[PDB]
């Protein structure tokens, strides 16, 4: 059933990252073409429960999907715990997730007052308050809409190209 998560036609925005509970039975790595395949605590059921998380991000941000990492993605979108045991699997998806003139469908959270706890998800769109005055739901000075969109165009440098990501966590 990893096919329904890897070969899914549509992926989630990283701020609204997707979580599939796996109740189930190295076939992934052997038929790879993956750019990132890093496992933590283990090298290639014997597990209570296993989760598959998937979303899209920039190429330069894949490094942040790792234990003890910092950045806009790790702080405000998707956080891995320090004791993480699992695998992080990523691959370039420019041919699907980029469009001429830009694909603006994939978003990320640019503003948050404090970091996310591990495996925390925040999909609120409340106006962010950068000063002492309340925003009352309206954008303006010191009152920012939290989400910002990626612009995936086919001719972006590899660091700004879309990468699909799946995170397997074992417990």
């Amino acid at each position: 059933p990893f096919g329904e998560v890897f070969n899914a036609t549509r992926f989630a925005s990283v701020y609204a990252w997707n979580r599939k509970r796996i109740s189930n039975c190295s076939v992934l790595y052997n038929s790879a073409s993956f750019s990132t395949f890093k496992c933590y605590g283990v090298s290639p059921l014997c597990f209570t429960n296993v989760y598959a998380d998937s979303f899209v991000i920039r190429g330069d941000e894949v490094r942040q999907i790792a234990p003890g990492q910092t950045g806009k993605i790790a702080d405000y979108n998707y956080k891995l715990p320090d004791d993480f045991t699992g695998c992080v699997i990523a691959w370039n998806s420019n041919n699907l997730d980029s469009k001429v003139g830009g694909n603006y469908n994939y978003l990320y959270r640019l503003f948050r007052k404090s970091n996310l706890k591990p495996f925390e998800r925040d999909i609120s769109t409340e106006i962010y308050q950068a000063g002492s005055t309340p925003c009352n739901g309206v954008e303006g000075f010191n009152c920012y809409f939290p989400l910002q969109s990626y612009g995936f165009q086919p001719t972006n440098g590899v660091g700004y190209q879309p990468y699909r990501v799946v995170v397997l966590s074992f417990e």
Partner: antibody
Amino acid sequence: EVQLVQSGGGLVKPGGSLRLSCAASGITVSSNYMSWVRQAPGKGLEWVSVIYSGGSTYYADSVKGRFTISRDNSKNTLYLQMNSLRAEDTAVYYCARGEGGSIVGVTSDYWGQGTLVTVSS
Amino acid sequence: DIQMTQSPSSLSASVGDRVTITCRASQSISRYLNWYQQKPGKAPKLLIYAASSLQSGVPSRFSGSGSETEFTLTISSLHPDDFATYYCQQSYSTLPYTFGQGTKVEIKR
């Protein structure tokens, strides 16, 4: 009026330390990307450090390990701790909101007046 | 890390003149570019952000344009106080971002 009022530069010997202050008004420092930028005498601008509202910090290679960006919410102030100072660090230092980005919120729109830091024997 | 080359380094022009300053990126950076003005020992002023957006406040005679690797800052009609050093700054690389080396503007008379 949103303002950033700086304080606390001065003279210091190579190896010594110094803390820069930036008291803000109209902006919540703990809620914002904040930045320190500097200019050596007769040179260009150099981004020194950035801090995220969540707490993540970033530094130019030339000051990594020796500098520390910090803040205090109850005094709404941004700080730069400078240790192991050297002649190259002789500059005028500026605090600013934002991180140098190009989206409102992360753009560097307001700045402090600057403070001179002189590292000399 | 990206490296920005401005041109020219120095530049003289009369009150009312059109003025143009170019900033060149060593690789393509989309529209991730900003322009600042700085009087000698004073704080930088943000003029243009995202290559072409006029920062609130800044007089309308300032305008920016460009994309990928070539960017221009344009003063449509020079005022006598506009003398300063003008910097560009890419916002494409890893933090902390980097600047161009600066273009100094003097008033001719």
